C-alpha cells in the first residue's frame, strides 16, 4: 500500500506518456490522409484526473473462457482520455490539420519526457533496493 | 531546456508559414483573377516575438498575413 | 510539407496552359478559327488559422 502509493505518480505519468506517444504516432501515420483532424491530449489535466480517479476504459469487454477449448476474443478497447483537437496552423485543400513540424516537436518532447520518467522511476526503485539489500 | 523546444517549434512553424506564403506568391505571379473577380494581392507574413511571459527574448510568432 | 502541392498545382496548370497555347498554334492555318484564351485563376484555400 505505502510502496504502491509512493510509486504511483511516476508510474501513472509514464503510462500517460505512453498513451500520448501512441496518439502522436497515430497523428504522424495519418499525416497524408485527407480529412483527418490531428488529435492530442492535455497531459496535466488528464494526469491529475487519472490520479484522483483510477484508470478506466471505454469498453474492453471480452468473451468469457470457462473451458480450456473456448476460442479467446476481445472487442475494441481504448483509454478514458479526452481526445482533443489541435488548432490548425495553415489551411489545406485535402482537409487535414496534421502539421508535421508540430507533430515531430511533440514527438521528440514526449520521447525525452518518457525517458525522464523511466530515469526517475528506476532511480527510486534502486533508492529502495539500496535500503533493503543487506 | 523545454522552453528551447517551444522556441524551436515556434520558429519552425513561422519559417514554414513564410515558405508557404512565398510558394503561394510564386504560383500566382501570372494570376489574373480570384473567385470574387478581384486581383490576387501578394501575401506577406508578419513576425513578432512570442516572449509574452519570457521578458524580451522568446520564440517568433506569425502575427498576421 | 504542403507547399509542394501548391507548386505542383502551379506546374501542372502551367502544363495545361502550354497545351492550350500549342493547340492554338497548331491551327495557324485553320480557316475561320478563333483562338482559345487562357488565364490562371487563383483559388484561396479557406480555413484556420492564418
Amino acid at each position: 500500500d505505502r510502496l504502491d502509493a509512493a510509486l504511483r505518480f511516476q508510474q501513472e505519468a509514464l503510462n500517460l506518456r505512453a498513451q500520448r506517444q501512441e496518439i502522436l504516432a497515430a497523428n504522424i501515420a495519418n499525416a497524408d490522409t485527407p480529412g483527418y483532424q490531428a488529435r492530442d491530449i492535455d497531459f496535466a489535466s488528464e494526469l491529475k484526473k487519472v490520479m484522483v480517479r483510477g484508470r478506466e476504459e471505454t469498453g474492453g469487454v471480452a468473451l468469457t473462457l470457462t473451458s480450456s477449448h473456448h476460442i479467446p476474443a476481445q472487442a475494441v478497447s481504448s483509454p478514458a482520455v479526452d481526445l482533443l483537437y489541435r488548432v490548425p496552423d495553415q489551411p489545406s485543400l485535402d482537409g487535414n490539420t496534421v502539421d508535421m513540424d508540430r507533430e515531430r516537436t511533440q514527438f521528440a518532447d514526449n520521447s525525452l519526457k518518457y525517458q525522464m520518467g523511466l530515469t526517475v522511476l528506476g532511480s527510486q526503485l534502486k533508492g529502495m533496493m539500496n535500503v533493503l539489500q543487506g | 531546456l523545454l522552453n528551447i523546444f517551444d522556441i524551436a517549434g515556434s520558429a519552425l512553424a513561422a519559417q514554414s508559414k513564410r515558405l508557404n506564403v512565398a510558394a503561394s506568391n510564386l504560383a500566382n505571379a501570372d494570376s489574373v483573377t480570384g473567385p470574387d473577380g478581384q486581383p490576387y494581392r501578394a501575401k506577406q507574413v508578419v513576425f513578432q516575438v512570442d516572449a509574452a511571459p519570457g521578458q524580451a527574448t522568446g520564440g517568433v510568432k506569425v502575427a498576421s498575413v | 510539407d504542403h507547399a509542394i502541392y501548391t507548386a505542383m498545382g502551379a506546374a501542372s496548370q502551367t502544363l495545361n496552359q502550354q497545351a492550350v497555347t500549342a493547340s492554338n498554334l497548331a491551327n495557324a492555318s485553320t480557316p475561320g478559327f478563333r483562338a482559345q484564351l487562357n488565364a490562371l485563376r487563383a483559388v484561396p484555400v479557406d480555413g484556420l488559422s492564418l
Binding site: 480529412g35 482533443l84 483537437y85 489541435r86 488548432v87 490548425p88 | 473567385p35 | 483559388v43 484555400v45
Partner: peptide
C-alpha cells in the same frame, strides 16, 4: 484560437472554391 493550442471542438471543413 492560438495555433498549436488544444480545443475540444473540431475545425470546420475547409474548401477552396473556384467561383463564388
Amino acid at each position: 484560437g492560438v495555433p498549436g493550442a488544444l480545443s475540444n471542438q473540431p475545425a470546420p471543413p475547409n474548401e477552396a472554391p473556384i467561383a463564388t
